[PDB]
Amino acid sequence: KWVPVTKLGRLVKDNKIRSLEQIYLHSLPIKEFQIIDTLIGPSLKDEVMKIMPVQKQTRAGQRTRFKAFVVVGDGNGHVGLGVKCSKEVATAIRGAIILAKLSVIPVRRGYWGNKIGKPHTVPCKVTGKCGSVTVRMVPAPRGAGIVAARVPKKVLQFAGIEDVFTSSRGSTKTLGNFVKATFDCLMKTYGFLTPDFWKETRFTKSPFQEYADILSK
RNA sequence: UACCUGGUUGAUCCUGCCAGUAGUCAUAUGCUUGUCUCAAAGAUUAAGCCAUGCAUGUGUAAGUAUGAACAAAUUCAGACUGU
Ligand SMILES: [K+]
Ligand SMILES: [Mg+2]
Ligand SMILES: [Mg+2]
């Protein structure tokens, strides 16, 4: 079936780690998509966003390969992006799905004004940049909806954000750069230091130290 | 009610524009047009030229009646006292 090759995979298969937040807290790399499948796999949905052909000139013609972009998300604060180039479209799509699962990230959602109910928009103004494409996300009031182009709108819907305003600059027709900039903007949500995070951190044992005895075999 | 997409390359990222998408109590034109309620309408070029018809007249007890205007009365007198 599945034979984990990493300590994190072994712990996830042994059920010692039960939530993705435990991994996110210590920022441990995730190198097996089976971890994501076991943890948040049931609630994950994938979508192919673009099949982009690329060509390399050769002495006997052009070698064509296809680029697959895949967006995965749970619609509840977890989203991931994957890009895979391969000779076959099916292989490219499979690799892109695996990469998106591996690259899933947590997304912070806040409130525009009054803080009643679950979060509906980004906690603060954020900006992501990939190549020449810059995507800016601004909080919006409840009921404003997702004001964004189709690609960022799909990314935000998979991330689970209810309402937001967006602005874009640069060559947004470059779909890869557009989606990557949106992903970077979403990732930057948890990197902003707000007053509510001013409390001193109370550290906890990392998984590798907590279950060191189990992993010692 | 804070949104983009196609087009320079063998392929890539850009600048950059062209094209597309939507709107006008915005004009005109093409085709089509069964019912109800609303409703603009010779401004844009020529404040260019105009046949014909109409669009400014007016009376209360209280300015002026002798129509040779009508009507009722007067057998005798009457300036006039209804229109
Ligand atoms: K008018
Ligand atoms: Mg604007
Ligand atoms: Mg060509």
Q: Which residue has the tokens 């409390």?
A: A199
Distance A179 CA to ligand 3 centre (A): 25
Distance A156 CA to ligand 3 centre (A): 34
Radius of gyration of chain A (CA): 19
Question: Measured in angstroms, what separates residue A135's CA from nucleotide B72's C1'?
Answer: 107
CA distance A68 to A142: 34
> Per this entry, what is the length of chain A?
217
Q: How many CA atoms lie within 13 A of A55 on its CB side?
A: 6
CA distance A108 to A130: 21
Cα–Cα distance list, A70 to A20, A60, A97, A180 (Å): 20, 32, 6, 11
The approach used to solve this structure was cryo-EM
Tell which strand B nucleotides have any atom below 7 Å from a protein Cβ: 1-7, 10-16
Distance A208 CA to ligand 1 centre (A): 81
Q: Residue A24's closest CA among A75, A84, A98, A80?
A: A80
CA distance A94 to A82: 10
Using a 7 A cutoff on CB, list residues near strand B: A 52-57, 62, 130-133, 138, 140, 144-145, 147-152, 165-168, 170-178
Cα–Cα distance list, A88 to A48, A53, A65, A99, A174 (Å): 15, 10, 7, 16, 22
Lookup: nucleotide whose C1' is closest to A53 CA: B11
The data reach a resolution, in angstroms, of 2.2
Strand partners, A57: A62
